Design an enzyme around this catalytic site. Structure first.
Site, PDB file in Angstrom:
ATOM      1  CG  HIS A  60       4.622   9.735  -9.091  1.00 41.81           C
ATOM      2  ND1 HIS A  60       5.517  10.211  -8.115  1.00 41.81           N
ATOM      3  CD2 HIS A  60       3.379  10.224  -8.727  1.00 41.81           C
ATOM      4  CE1 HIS A  60       4.861  10.957  -7.258  1.00 41.81           C
ATOM      5  NE2 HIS A  60       3.605  10.982  -7.589  1.00 41.81           N
ATOM      6  CG  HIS A  90      -2.538  12.989 -10.558  1.00 41.93           C
ATOM      7  ND1 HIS A  90      -2.840  13.396  -9.269  1.00 41.93           N
ATOM      8  CD2 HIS A  90      -2.788  11.615 -10.579  1.00 41.93           C
ATOM      9  CE1 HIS A  90      -3.266  12.347  -8.596  1.00 41.93           C
ATOM     10  NE2 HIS A  90      -3.204  11.278  -9.364  1.00 41.93           N
ATOM     11  CG  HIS A  92      -3.058   7.223 -12.808  1.00 43.73           C
ATOM     12  ND1 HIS A  92      -1.943   6.937 -12.063  1.00 43.73           N
ATOM     13  CD2 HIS A  92      -3.811   8.001 -12.065  1.00 43.73           C
ATOM     14  CE1 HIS A  92      -2.030   7.495 -10.882  1.00 43.73           C
ATOM     15  NE2 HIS A  92      -3.223   8.154 -10.871  1.00 43.73           N
ATOM     16  CG  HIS A 115      -7.023   9.771 -10.015  1.00 44.68           C
ATOM     17  ND1 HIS A 115      -6.014   8.851  -9.854  1.00 44.68           N
ATOM     18  CD2 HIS A 115      -8.025   9.054 -10.493  1.00 44.68           C
ATOM     19  CE1 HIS A 115      -6.398   7.660 -10.175  1.00 44.68           C
ATOM     20  NE2 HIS A 115      -7.656   7.746 -10.592  1.00 44.68           N
ATOM     21  CB  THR A 195       1.019   6.320  -6.175  1.00 42.43           C
ATOM     22  OG1 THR A 195       0.777   7.525  -5.334  1.00 42.43           O
ATOM     23  CG2 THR A 195       0.461   6.474  -7.560  1.00 42.43           C
TER      24      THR A 195
END
Ligand SMILES: [Zn+2]
Length: 255
Positions: A60, A90, A92, A115, A195
């Site tokens: 993801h 990570h 997005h 993040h 998430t």
């Protein structure tokens, strides 16, 4: 769960009822509505002793993990009480430069969002922290397309090695300080993970000042696969969730 048409964010609620809870993230930050809180203390980012171990594609996103067995990389001050340990960071992003961030500013969307995930050490392990309202502290950083971010290249270059889900690669000696903007002015509100499990245990710290990355840098992100090796290729793009209702909550500003 994913970001496809059939397993996308509009479906998570089925599996994760908390999806339509009272303190869901991300949100749109209305700069005119945000409340200047003078009682807000300056952020304290201590990452000089940070120990990065590896990078992995969890299907993801790609996560850079750190050694959180000791107070090596921590976050304190600001709206927080006690020390929060960096466990992983990570991103997005979008299929276009016009989208990708989680949080929006006055409805404006950035290319991507960084993040940096920290967990309240009073709780002993990440696992227990995610079970508390003051369990996590996530540092959110907006990414805009412009000039290259030198400090981010070490990460871009390793992406080839973890193209599919379940791949990981040693990633030692990475210094997260190279991803920070000049100013540490921020916005803060009580939210959740963006998430699944979408647990409402996060204290969000959204930096006002975005960092810029080159088109070539973000482009490598879009070459990632959601799928596992030897499966139909599904590019890892748009791994973001639509903004949620603030529902009474108040967004405070440090500036
Ligand atoms: Zn995230």
């Amino acid at each position: 769960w994913g970001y496809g048409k059939h397993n996308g964010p509009e479906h998570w609620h089925k599996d994760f009822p908390i999806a339509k809870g009272e303190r869901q993230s991300p949100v749109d930050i209305d700069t005119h509505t945000a409340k200047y809180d003078p009682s807000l203390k300056p952020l304290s980012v201590s990452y000089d002793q940070a120990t990065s171990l590896r990078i992995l594609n969890n299907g993801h996103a790609f996560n850079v993990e750190f050694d959180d067995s000791q107070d090596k990389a921590v976050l304190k001050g600001g709206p927080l009480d006690g020390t929060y340990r960096l466990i992983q960071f990570h991103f997005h992003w979008g299929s276009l430069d016009g989208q990708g961030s989680e949080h929006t500013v006055d409805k404006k969307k950035y290319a991507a969002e960084l993040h940096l995930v920290h967990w309240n050490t009073k709780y002993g392990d990440f696992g227990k922290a995610v079970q508390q309202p003051d369990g996590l502290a996530v540092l959110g950083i907006f990414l805009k397309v412009g000039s290259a971010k030198p400090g981010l290249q070490k990460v871009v270059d390793v992406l080839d090695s973890i193209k599919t889900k379940g791949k990981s690669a040693d990633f030692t000696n990475f210094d997260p300080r190279g991803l920070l903007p000049e100013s540490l002015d921020y916005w803060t509100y009580p939210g959740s993970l963006v998430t699944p499990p979408l647990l409402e245990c996060v204290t969000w710290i959204v930096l006002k000042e975005p960092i810029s990355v080159s088109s070539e840098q973000v482009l490598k992100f879009r070459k990632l696969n959601f799928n596992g090796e030897g499966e139909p290729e599904e590019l890892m793009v748009d791994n973001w969730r639509p903004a949620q209702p603030l529902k009474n909550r108040q967004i405070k500003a440090s500036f």
